[PDB]
Amino acid sequence: HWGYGKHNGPEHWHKDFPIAKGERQSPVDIDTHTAKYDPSLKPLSVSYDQATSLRILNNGHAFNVEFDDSQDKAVLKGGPLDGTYRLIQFHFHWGSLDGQGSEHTVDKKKYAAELHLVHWNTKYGDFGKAVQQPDGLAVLGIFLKVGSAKPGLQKVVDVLDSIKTKGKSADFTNFDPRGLLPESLDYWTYPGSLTTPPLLECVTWIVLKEPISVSSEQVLKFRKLNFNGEGEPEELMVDNWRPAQPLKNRQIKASFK
Ligand SMILES: NS(=O)(=O)c1ccc(C(=O)N2CCc3cc(O)c(O)cc3C2)cc1
Ligand SMILES: [Zn+2]
């Protein structure tokens, strides 16, 4: 099955998921000079005060921090969005080295990692129905650079030892995702897709301009995770990013001048 290796990585995905070569695939390079400022774009509303994290899972591709999405608790609205989108999970993509790992790029710059906070449009009732719709998901993407530690990330980092291998989970309650946000909510936005199989073209992407800083030690701990299951040959969970895809007939809009 699909993964990030030589034999099952991004350049193979199209064989099982032909939408891989579609018209609105993600990620993309954000050409900052070509992105147009859109004065009609609203400030993003990130309302995470009542967020209820439940669990952290190593799914063999990344780790997901999962949230209770059975009520309007942690929601994303405004910005380019119409209606209310509920937080279901977050995860990261990262590299084997600090010079790569992000999925989106900014004028071809790769960041060390990229955080995806995944939300679904409440008008579709559940996540599985939402992914079948062109406006079903809103993914908030946040770049990570290596520098000072992110204190709000440390709780995540410290639990990774308990979910080293594929299919392991751990209780992960009371985690506040507000601690993963940068100061500014300036963003770029464009219509795109899931960046892993099934690659569904259901996402409004909202990518923050300002990266967060994490420490070298924090990202090193991401790189100790395993793609493999327990008692299988150790394959370090690194380079779990899809490269930039063709922009085709799309415009990237900026919320800021
Ligand atoms: N990298 S990204 O674009 O932010 C991204 C966001 C979300 C997901 C995701 O949670 N998935 C894929 C689609 C899917 C579809 C299902 O029907 C399902 O039950 C579960 C899932 C699980 C994967 C990737
Ligand atoms: Zn992702």
XYZ file of N, CA and C and ligand atoms in Angstrom:
796
model
N 0.833 -1.250 0.000
C 0.000 0.000 0.000
C 0.829 1.245 0.000
N 0.153 2.374 -0.039
C 0.854 3.640 -0.258
C 1.637 4.063 0.953
N 2.703 4.796 0.694
C 3.548 5.362 1.759
C 4.451 6.460 1.231
N 5.655 6.541 1.781
C 6.589 7.589 1.380
C 7.924 7.076 0.865
N 8.028 5.764 0.756
C 9.280 5.109 0.268
C 9.496 5.203 -1.245
N 10.599 4.628 -1.715
C 10.981 4.641 -3.163
C 9.954 3.889 -3.993
N 9.360 2.884 -3.360
C 8.500 1.964 -4.096
C 7.037 2.229 -3.946
N 6.651 3.095 -3.004
C 5.237 3.351 -2.745
C 4.923 4.828 -2.443
N 5.873 5.704 -2.750
C 5.778 7.121 -2.428
C 4.918 7.922 -3.406
N 4.924 9.265 -3.255
C 4.056 10.157 -4.004
C 3.992 9.931 -5.509
N 5.093 9.541 -6.137
C 5.090 9.380 -7.589
C 4.372 8.099 -8.033
N 4.042 7.232 -7.074
C 3.262 6.005 -7.325
C 1.784 6.106 -7.061
N 1.391 7.114 -6.287
C 0.023 7.179 -5.786
C -1.041 7.189 -6.848
N -0.742 7.803 -7.992
C -1.716 7.932 -9.069
C -2.240 6.596 -9.569
N -1.467 5.521 -9.417
C -1.908 4.191 -9.886
C -3.114 3.661 -9.123
N -3.156 3.918 -7.827
C -4.353 3.578 -7.027
C -5.349 4.707 -6.838
N -4.862 5.929 -7.012
C -5.665 7.124 -6.772
C -5.484 8.074 -7.935
N -6.195 7.830 -9.072
C -5.908 8.631 -10.264
C -6.115 10.148 -10.118
N -6.898 10.556 -9.123
C -7.125 11.975 -8.829
C -5.795 12.660 -8.466
N -4.758 11.864 -8.191
C -3.416 12.403 -7.931
C -2.966 13.356 -9.019
N -3.444 13.129 -10.253
C -3.114 13.992 -11.391
C -4.240 14.981 -11.712
N -5.049 15.290 -10.706
C -6.233 16.114 -10.903
C -5.967 17.606 -11.033
N -7.063 18.337 -11.064
C -7.035 19.766 -11.335
C -6.895 20.643 -10.100
N -7.049 20.080 -8.910
C -6.925 20.893 -7.676
C -6.179 20.125 -6.574
N -4.985 19.669 -6.926
C -4.171 18.891 -5.976
C -3.321 19.770 -5.090
N -3.069 19.248 -3.902
C -2.211 19.868 -2.912
C -1.064 18.952 -2.503
N 0.024 19.519 -1.955
C 0.280 20.944 -1.733
C 0.715 21.616 -3.042
N 0.979 22.909 -2.921
C 1.456 23.752 -4.008
C 2.555 24.661 -3.483
N 3.383 25.167 -4.381
C 4.266 26.287 -4.101
C 3.462 27.569 -4.050
N 3.680 28.368 -3.020
C 3.029 29.652 -2.890
C 4.038 30.694 -3.386
N 3.750 31.213 -4.564
C 4.562 32.269 -5.154
C 4.029 33.566 -4.557
N 4.792 34.129 -3.651
C 4.326 35.272 -2.859
C 4.109 36.521 -3.670
N 4.815 36.631 -4.791
C 4.683 37.794 -5.653
C 3.444 37.740 -6.522
N 3.022 36.529 -6.874
C 1.821 36.266 -7.692
C 0.500 36.157 -6.895
N 0.586 35.844 -5.611
C -0.599 35.726 -4.762
C -1.198 37.117 -4.689
N -2.492 37.229 -4.920
C -3.120 38.555 -4.880
C -3.745 38.821 -3.529
N -3.458 39.999 -3.011
C -4.156 40.496 -1.845
C -5.638 40.625 -2.187
N -6.474 40.052 -1.348
C -7.923 40.080 -1.531
C -8.571 40.823 -0.364
N -8.931 42.103 -0.566
C -9.442 42.878 0.571
C -10.798 42.381 1.076
N -11.455 41.552 0.283
C -12.751 40.955 0.671
C -12.606 39.768 1.634
N -11.385 39.270 1.783
C -11.115 38.168 2.729
C -11.226 38.676 4.159
N -11.893 37.896 4.992
C -12.084 38.244 6.405
C -10.947 37.715 7.257
N -10.782 38.282 8.466
C -9.863 37.698 9.404
C -10.343 36.304 9.682
N -9.398 35.424 9.916
C -9.709 34.083 10.316
C -10.214 34.122 11.762
N -11.221 33.318 12.041
C -11.722 33.084 13.394
C -11.370 31.672 13.828
N -10.433 31.586 14.749
C -9.982 30.328 15.315
C -10.505 30.293 16.760
N -11.496 29.465 17.038
C -12.156 29.421 18.363
C -11.891 28.050 18.960
N -10.757 27.950 19.627
C -10.279 26.706 20.223
C -10.383 26.664 21.755
N -11.015 27.666 22.389
C -11.147 27.655 23.872
C -11.745 26.378 24.487
N -12.692 25.755 23.796
C -13.380 24.569 24.363
C -12.927 23.263 23.720
N -11.794 23.299 23.048
C -11.265 22.096 22.387
C -11.112 20.939 23.385
N -11.512 19.752 22.950
C -11.403 18.501 23.738
C -10.592 17.474 23.001
N -9.298 17.439 23.286
C -8.452 16.421 22.697
C -8.743 15.103 23.405
N -8.609 14.007 22.677
C -8.903 12.690 23.256
C -7.736 11.735 23.242
N -7.024 11.681 22.126
C -6.130 10.567 21.872
C -5.095 10.971 20.847
N -3.959 10.298 20.858
C -2.917 10.454 19.857
C -2.642 9.075 19.267
N -2.539 9.016 17.942
C -2.439 7.774 17.200
C -1.291 7.833 16.214
N -0.451 6.819 16.181
C 0.491 6.612 15.082
C -0.226 5.778 14.037
N -0.544 6.366 12.896
C -1.317 5.666 11.848
C -0.452 5.054 10.753
N 0.864 5.040 10.983
C 1.819 4.517 10.006
C 2.283 5.505 8.959
N 1.679 6.675 8.915
C 2.104 7.785 8.005
C 2.521 9.033 8.753
N 1.876 9.284 9.871
C 2.102 10.420 10.751
C 1.537 10.043 12.128
N 1.467 11.008 13.033
C 0.644 10.864 14.231
C -0.486 11.877 14.223
N -1.679 11.442 14.600
C -2.837 12.304 14.656
C -3.206 12.548 16.112
N -3.359 13.805 16.499
C -4.002 14.178 17.753
C -5.475 14.411 17.431
N -6.324 13.591 18.029
C -7.741 13.531 17.698
C -8.540 14.307 18.732
N -9.619 14.909 18.250
C -10.512 15.732 19.061
C -11.932 15.189 19.033
N -12.656 15.456 20.112
C -14.097 15.227 20.144
C -14.763 16.258 19.241
N -15.304 15.804 18.119
C -15.987 16.691 17.157
C -17.494 16.424 17.123
N -18.016 15.911 18.233
C -19.480 15.607 18.352
C -20.338 16.821 18.770
N -19.676 17.936 19.025
C -20.317 19.239 19.256
C -19.467 20.359 18.703
N -20.069 21.540 18.531
C -19.331 22.772 18.162
C -18.542 23.233 19.366
N -17.351 22.714 19.435
C -16.328 23.095 20.383
C -15.245 23.855 19.603
N -14.260 23.211 19.128
C -13.142 23.856 18.484
C -13.490 24.108 17.015
N -13.747 25.355 16.629
C -14.185 25.640 15.274
C -13.378 26.727 14.583
N -13.340 26.581 13.275
C -12.724 27.526 12.371
C -13.840 28.129 11.540
N -13.846 29.447 11.437
C -14.765 30.170 10.550
C -14.146 31.458 10.077
N -14.889 32.202 9.283
C -14.361 33.403 8.679
C -13.310 33.096 7.661
N -12.432 34.058 7.470
C -11.446 33.942 6.417
C -12.182 33.785 5.090
N -11.799 32.772 4.269
C -12.466 32.524 3.005
C -13.719 31.643 3.144
N -13.955 31.171 4.361
C -14.942 30.119 4.623
C -16.339 30.667 4.770
N -17.265 29.864 4.307
C -18.682 30.073 4.542
C -19.102 28.987 5.539
N -19.732 29.385 6.612
C -20.137 28.459 7.636
C -19.040 28.066 8.628
N -19.280 26.945 9.277
C -18.569 26.545 10.485
C -17.895 25.228 10.241
N -16.617 25.179 10.582
C -15.834 23.978 10.385
C -15.281 23.506 11.723
N -15.519 22.243 12.025
C -15.141 21.655 13.297
C -13.780 20.893 13.260
N -12.935 21.178 14.255
C -11.632 20.519 14.376
C -11.837 19.042 14.687
N -11.229 18.171 13.879
C -11.286 16.735 14.112
C -9.931 16.153 14.499
N -8.844 16.635 13.883
C -7.519 16.139 14.216
C -6.466 17.114 13.738
N -5.292 17.043 14.343
C -4.119 17.646 13.745
C -2.994 16.627 13.633
N -2.088 16.900 12.696
C -0.912 16.091 12.481
C 0.125 16.965 11.811
N 1.306 16.408 11.632
C 2.427 17.094 11.013
C 2.985 16.277 9.840
N 3.747 16.976 9.002
C 4.622 16.371 7.992
C 6.002 16.922 8.283
N 7.045 16.109 8.186
C 8.400 16.567 8.500
C 9.439 15.800 7.724
N 10.670 16.304 7.814
C 11.769 15.809 7.022
C 12.739 14.951 7.802
N 13.676 14.389 7.051
C 14.843 13.704 7.633
C 15.947 14.657 8.085
N 15.884 15.888 7.585
C 16.813 16.984 7.847
C 16.045 18.288 7.943
N 16.607 19.323 8.567
C 15.835 20.585 8.761
C 15.476 21.310 7.452
N 16.226 21.026 6.385
C 16.023 21.673 5.097
C 14.874 21.176 4.251
N 14.113 20.223 4.764
C 12.930 19.745 4.065
C 11.928 19.222 5.092
N 10.690 19.024 4.652
C 9.633 18.444 5.490
C 8.286 19.068 5.240
N 8.247 20.370 4.913
C 6.963 20.979 4.623
C 6.415 20.469 3.298
N 5.104 20.548 3.195
C 4.373 20.181 1.988
C 4.184 21.409 1.086
N 3.524 22.439 1.597
C 3.585 23.729 0.926
C 4.965 24.265 0.997
N 5.301 25.054 -0.003
C 6.558 25.784 -0.046
C 6.239 27.258 -0.277
N 7.171 28.159 0.025
C 6.927 29.613 -0.115
C 8.077 30.130 -0.954
N 7.782 30.528 -2.183
C 8.836 30.875 -3.141
C 9.924 29.782 -3.187
N 9.445 28.537 -3.216
C 10.254 27.287 -3.306
C 10.983 26.933 -2.007
N 10.886 27.790 -0.988
C 11.437 27.469 0.340
C 10.657 26.332 0.995
N 11.400 25.333 1.448
C 10.889 24.228 2.262
C 11.178 24.511 3.729
N 10.161 24.386 4.570
C 10.341 24.452 5.999
C 10.614 23.049 6.569
N 11.054 22.990 7.818
C 11.418 21.741 8.490
C 10.203 20.831 8.667
N 9.033 21.421 8.777
C 7.815 20.651 9.033
C 6.619 21.546 8.753
N 5.453 20.936 8.745
C 4.194 21.626 8.521
C 3.110 20.935 9.358
N 2.407 21.736 10.128
C 1.273 21.337 10.952
C -0.025 21.542 10.156
N -0.884 20.527 10.168
C -2.211 20.571 9.571
C -3.271 20.379 10.627
N -4.069 21.423 10.882
C -5.240 21.347 11.724
C -6.440 21.146 10.823
N -7.047 19.970 10.931
C -8.084 19.553 9.992
C -9.479 19.760 10.542
N -10.296 20.437 9.757
C -11.673 20.785 10.140
C -12.654 20.394 9.069
N -13.863 20.001 9.466
C -14.921 19.663 8.490
C -16.139 20.520 8.626
N -16.774 20.749 7.473
C -17.900 21.638 7.363
C -19.138 21.004 7.985
N -19.643 21.657 9.024
C -20.752 21.101 9.780
C -22.029 20.920 8.962
N -22.124 21.613 7.834
C -23.318 21.464 6.999
C -23.439 20.062 6.396
N -22.348 19.293 6.405
C -22.355 17.913 5.878
C -22.469 16.842 6.963
N -22.572 17.270 8.206
C -22.936 16.361 9.291
C -21.872 15.445 9.877
N -20.995 14.886 9.037
C -19.847 14.118 9.538
C -18.673 14.248 8.581
N -17.503 13.848 9.053
C -16.263 13.951 8.310
C -16.313 13.136 7.035
N -16.802 11.906 7.135
C -16.829 11.064 5.962
C -17.687 11.607 4.816
N -18.782 12.268 5.147
C -19.623 12.925 4.137
C -18.931 14.195 3.614
N -18.306 14.921 4.523
C -17.625 16.175 4.159
C -16.529 15.972 3.115
N -15.773 14.886 3.197
C -14.650 14.682 2.266
C -15.126 14.411 0.838
N -16.434 14.171 0.678
C -17.031 13.953 -0.658
C -17.497 15.256 -1.316
N -17.231 16.374 -0.666
C -17.736 17.674 -1.135
C -16.599 18.653 -1.419
N -16.774 19.552 -2.413
C -15.660 20.439 -2.747
C -15.304 21.457 -1.663
N -16.258 21.760 -0.796
C -16.048 22.667 0.330
C -16.234 21.905 1.642
N -15.818 20.650 1.678
C -16.047 19.850 2.861
C -15.091 20.052 4.021
N -13.831 20.368 3.699
C -12.780 20.523 4.685
C -12.120 21.878 4.615
N -11.632 22.320 5.759
C -10.737 23.467 5.846
C -9.543 22.995 6.640
N -8.369 23.068 6.023
C -7.141 22.656 6.685
C -6.334 23.933 6.918
N -5.983 24.188 8.170
C -5.127 25.290 8.579
C -3.708 24.747 8.620
N -2.849 25.275 7.760
C -1.466 24.843 7.693
C -0.529 25.856 8.283
N 0.416 25.352 9.075
C 1.323 26.222 9.821
C 2.716 25.663 9.618
N 3.632 26.472 9.146
C 5.016 26.047 8.938
C 5.779 26.006 10.258
N 6.716 25.059 10.359
C 7.653 24.942 11.479
C 9.071 25.196 10.949
N 9.784 26.096 11.627
C 11.213 26.278 11.455
C 11.922 25.875 12.755
N 13.174 25.510 12.615
C 13.980 25.105 13.772
C 14.702 26.313 14.373
N 14.474 26.512 15.642
C 15.106 27.617 16.374
C 14.805 27.427 17.856
N 14.107 28.396 18.440
C 13.658 28.282 19.827
C 12.561 27.217 19.952
N 12.519 26.558 21.110
C 11.476 25.579 21.414
C 10.089 26.232 21.412
N 9.089 25.440 21.016
C 7.684 25.806 21.164
C 7.141 25.141 22.415
N 6.959 25.908 23.501
C 6.578 25.236 24.760
C 5.271 24.450 24.666
N 4.333 24.956 23.876
C 3.019 24.331 23.671
C 3.058 23.039 22.891
N 4.185 22.765 22.247
C 4.402 21.493 21.551
C 4.956 20.372 22.453
N 5.549 20.711 23.596
C 6.327 19.721 24.357
C 5.490 18.520 24.815
N 4.240 18.762 25.199
C 3.335 17.658 25.634
C 3.171 16.609 24.515
N 3.091 17.087 23.282
C 3.016 16.176 22.131
C 4.325 15.377 22.023
N 5.441 16.105 22.013
C 6.768 15.502 21.868
C 6.981 14.386 22.906
N 6.577 14.653 24.136
C 6.891 13.714 25.227
C 6.077 12.408 25.207
N 4.947 12.401 24.494
C 4.098 11.222 24.408
C 4.525 10.309 23.242
N 5.384 10.817 22.355
C 5.723 10.072 21.133
C 6.397 8.721 21.407
N 7.165 8.677 22.485
C 7.778 7.420 22.925
C 6.775 6.287 23.145
N 5.549 6.651 23.503
C 4.500 5.663 23.814
C 3.721 5.239 22.568
N 3.942 5.939 21.449
C 3.288 5.575 20.179
C 4.303 5.396 19.050
N 5.404 4.717 19.346
C 6.537 4.653 18.428
C 6.165 4.055 17.077
N 5.328 3.026 17.117
C 5.032 2.204 15.962
C 3.543 2.285 15.519
N 3.345 1.943 14.258
C 2.064 2.001 13.558
C 1.023 1.255 14.334
N -0.136 1.871 14.507
C -1.271 1.286 15.249
C -1.278 1.486 16.749
N -0.213 2.067 17.297
C -0.200 2.441 18.703
C -0.914 3.749 18.933
N -1.697 3.787 19.992
C -2.349 4.996 20.483
C -2.146 5.189 21.982
N -2.380 6.419 22.400
C -2.292 6.807 23.807
C -3.341 7.881 24.151
N -3.916 7.759 25.319
C -4.795 8.799 25.846
C -4.046 10.133 25.735
N -4.749 11.165 25.293
C -4.134 12.487 25.085
C -5.171 13.579 25.296
N -5.605 13.682 26.528
C -6.620 14.624 26.925
C -6.050 15.948 27.361
N -6.888 16.966 27.287
C -6.608 18.284 27.826
C -5.454 18.994 27.106
N -5.200 18.629 25.851
C -4.196 19.336 25.071
C -4.821 20.552 24.400
N -4.205 21.713 24.567
C -4.695 22.965 24.039
C -3.973 23.346 22.732
N -4.655 23.181 21.584
C -3.968 23.487 20.317
C -3.653 24.954 20.090
N -4.206 25.829 20.917
C -3.853 27.273 20.825
C -2.371 27.487 21.019
N -1.717 26.577 21.744
C -0.276 26.678 21.983
C 0.596 26.340 20.793
N -0.013 25.971 19.666
C 0.721 25.680 18.439
C 0.611 26.785 17.383
N -0.089 27.855 17.699
C -0.339 28.925 16.748
C 0.720 30.023 16.815
N 1.025 30.637 15.686
C 1.903 31.788 15.706
C 1.119 33.020 16.154
N 1.814 34.145 16.290
C 1.174 35.403 16.720
C 0.171 35.893 15.706
N 0.602 35.914 14.441
C -0.208 36.474 13.372
C -1.087 35.419 12.709
N -2.297 35.804 12.321
C -3.190 34.916 11.539
C -3.271 35.370 10.066
N -2.293 36.157 9.600
C -2.197 36.449 8.156
C -2.044 35.118 7.405
N -2.723 34.989 6.268
C -2.749 33.732 5.560
C -2.839 33.874 4.052
N -2.486 32.775 3.378
C -2.807 32.536 1.977
C -3.911 31.488 1.927
N -4.716 31.511 0.883
C -5.774 30.524 0.710
C -5.961 30.128 -0.750
N -6.276 28.865 -0.984
C -6.552 28.361 -2.318
C -7.350 27.063 -2.186
N -8.044 26.648 -3.249
C -8.800 25.404 -3.226
C -7.904 24.243 -3.606
N -7.927 23.196 -2.808
C -7.051 22.055 -3.042
C -7.614 20.745 -2.560
N -6.702 19.887 -2.122
C -6.984 18.485 -1.839
C -6.373 17.997 -0.545
N -6.785 16.804 -0.129
C -5.994 16.058 0.827
C -4.618 15.831 0.221
N -3.574 15.827 1.046
C -2.232 15.619 0.533
C -1.772 14.174 0.691
N -2.625 13.304 1.250
C -2.387 11.856 1.262
C -3.555 11.201 0.557
N -3.331 9.988 0.032
C -4.469 9.196 -0.394
C -5.589 9.213 0.650
N -6.853 9.320 0.227
C -7.373 9.283 -1.152
C -7.254 10.552 -2.025
N -6.573 11.585 -1.547
C -6.257 12.759 -2.376
C -7.505 13.522 -2.843
N -8.579 13.405 -2.076
C -9.857 13.990 -2.468
C -9.784 15.503 -2.530
N -10.456 16.052 -3.527
C -10.396 17.480 -3.823
C -11.497 18.211 -3.057
N -11.341 18.215 -1.741
C -12.394 18.630 -0.803
C -11.927 19.710 0.164
N -10.733 20.294 -0.057
C -10.125 21.155 0.949
C -10.028 22.622 0.539
N -10.480 23.537 1.412
C -10.083 24.936 1.366
C -8.837 25.048 2.237
N -7.708 25.314 1.610
C -6.446 25.461 2.314
C -6.298 26.859 2.829
N -5.858 26.974 4.075
C -5.558 28.252 4.703
C -4.166 28.088 5.313
N -3.155 28.706 4.710
C -1.763 28.532 5.125
C -1.282 29.821 5.754
N -0.875 29.756 7.016
C -0.430 30.952 7.730
C 0.938 31.393 7.212
N 1.096 32.694 7.074
C 2.370 33.268 6.653
C 3.473 33.111 7.683
N 3.134 33.257 8.955
C 4.138 33.244 10.021
C 4.395 31.824 10.514
N 5.625 31.334 10.401
C 5.942 30.038 10.952
C 6.047 30.084 12.469
N 5.895 28.921 13.078
C 6.240 28.751 14.467
C 7.654 28.206 14.523
N 8.341 28.530 15.601
C 9.653 27.971 15.871
C 9.550 26.809 16.823
N 10.222 25.731 16.476
C 10.372 24.581 17.352
C 11.849 24.279 17.540
N 12.238 23.546 18.584
C 13.669 23.313 18.768
C 14.147 22.102 17.966
N 15.446 22.051 17.781
C 16.027 20.918 17.105
C 15.688 19.623 17.855
N 15.694 19.686 19.182
C 15.377 18.517 19.986
C 13.922 18.061 19.791
N 13.024 19.022 19.648
C 11.607 18.687 19.420
C 11.434 17.942 18.090
N 12.019 18.476 17.031
C 11.839 17.829 15.719
C 12.603 16.493 15.655
N 13.749 16.420 16.326
C 14.494 15.152 16.409
C 13.626 14.029 16.980
N 12.780 14.382 17.934
C 11.883 13.405 18.544
C 10.785 12.947 17.566
N 10.313 13.830 16.694
C 9.422 13.410 15.607
C 10.087 12.324 14.773
N 11.372 12.526 14.506
C 12.153 11.626 13.632
C 12.534 10.273 14.247
N 12.191 10.061 15.508
C 12.400 8.780 16.157
C 11.196 7.873 16.042
N 10.074 8.421 15.573
C 8.888 7.616 15.303
C 9.187 6.604 14.184
N 8.337 5.619 14.075
C 8.465 4.553 13.073
C 7.236 4.470 12.147
N 7.466 4.258 10.848
C 6.369 3.949 9.906
C 5.822 2.542 10.129
N 6.729 1.658 10.506
C 6.434 0.222 10.694
C 5.679 -0.054 11.992
N 5.034 -1.220 12.012
C 4.455 -1.786 13.220
C 5.514 -2.420 14.127
N 5.133 -2.624 15.384
C 5.965 -3.271 16.393
C 6.463 -4.609 15.886
N 7.740 -4.861 16.126
C 8.388 -6.105 15.713
C 8.628 -6.266 14.226
N 8.471 -5.157 13.496
C 8.779 -5.113 12.059
C 10.095 -4.353 11.884
N 10.745 -4.512 10.719
C 11.992 -3.822 10.441
C 11.791 -2.328 10.644
N 12.698 -1.719 11.392
C 12.575 -0.315 11.729
C 12.802 0.566 10.513
N 11.796 1.366 10.235
C 11.812 2.381 9.194
C 11.446 3.692 9.882
N 12.396 4.621 9.985
C 12.145 5.870 10.671
C 11.081 6.644 9.918
N 10.169 7.219 10.687
C 9.096 8.066 10.152
C 9.697 9.445 9.900
N 10.174 9.604 8.668
C 10.777 10.854 8.195
C 10.387 11.031 6.732
N 10.359 12.282 6.291
C 10.043 12.588 4.875
C 8.651 12.116 4.483
N 7.707 12.362 5.380
C 6.304 12.010 5.161
C 5.551 13.206 4.590
N 6.139 13.813 3.571
C 5.570 14.950 2.859
C 5.414 14.637 1.388
N 4.345 15.162 0.809
C 4.108 15.159 -0.640
C 4.719 16.429 -1.214
N 5.454 16.355 -2.338
C 5.978 17.577 -2.963
C 4.884 18.431 -3.594
N 5.261 19.660 -3.881
C 4.374 20.612 -4.551
C 3.858 20.060 -5.884
N 2.551 20.263 -6.105
C 1.819 19.809 -7.277
C 1.500 20.981 -8.197
N 1.186 20.712 -9.481
C 0.903 21.832 -10.370
C -0.302 22.689 -9.942
N -0.137 24.004 -10.001
C -1.201 24.927 -9.604
C -2.377 24.898 -10.566
N -2.091 24.632 -11.829
C -3.129 24.566 -12.884
C -3.992 25.830 -12.857
N -5.307 25.692 -12.935
C -6.169 26.843 -13.099
C -6.642 27.306 -11.734
N -5.670 27.760 -10.908
C -5.975 28.258 -9.565
C -5.243 29.527 -9.205
N -5.883 30.337 -8.349
C -5.319 31.567 -7.830
C -5.134 31.394 -6.324
N -3.958 31.764 -5.837
C -3.710 31.852 -4.408
C -3.973 33.292 -3.967
N -4.791 33.437 -2.934
C -5.188 34.751 -2.422
C -4.526 34.991 -1.088
N -4.098 36.233 -0.860
C -3.478 36.662 0.388
C -4.471 37.495 1.199
N -4.479 37.286 2.513
C -5.325 38.073 3.418
C -4.690 39.401 3.799
N -3.442 39.583 3.398
C -2.619 40.701 3.886
C -1.915 41.390 2.722
N -1.554 42.648 2.950
C -0.896 43.494 1.940
C 0.610 43.223 1.905
N -2.606 16.120 4.945
S -4.089 16.641 4.975
O -4.509 16.971 3.655
O -4.298 17.646 5.937
C -5.081 15.336 5.494
C -6.244 15.593 6.239
C -7.075 14.593 6.687
C -6.778 13.288 6.476
C -7.655 12.243 7.075
O -7.888 12.430 8.296
N -8.040 11.169 6.370
C -7.961 11.040 4.969
C -9.320 10.977 4.332
C -10.236 10.091 5.057
C -11.400 9.662 4.409
C -12.273 8.827 5.116
O -13.408 8.435 4.413
C -11.970 8.442 6.438
O -12.848 7.614 7.133
C -10.809 8.866 7.071
C -9.947 9.692 6.360
C -8.730 10.094 7.088
C -5.635 12.965 5.742
C -4.811 13.993 5.262
Zn -1.415 16.803 6.366
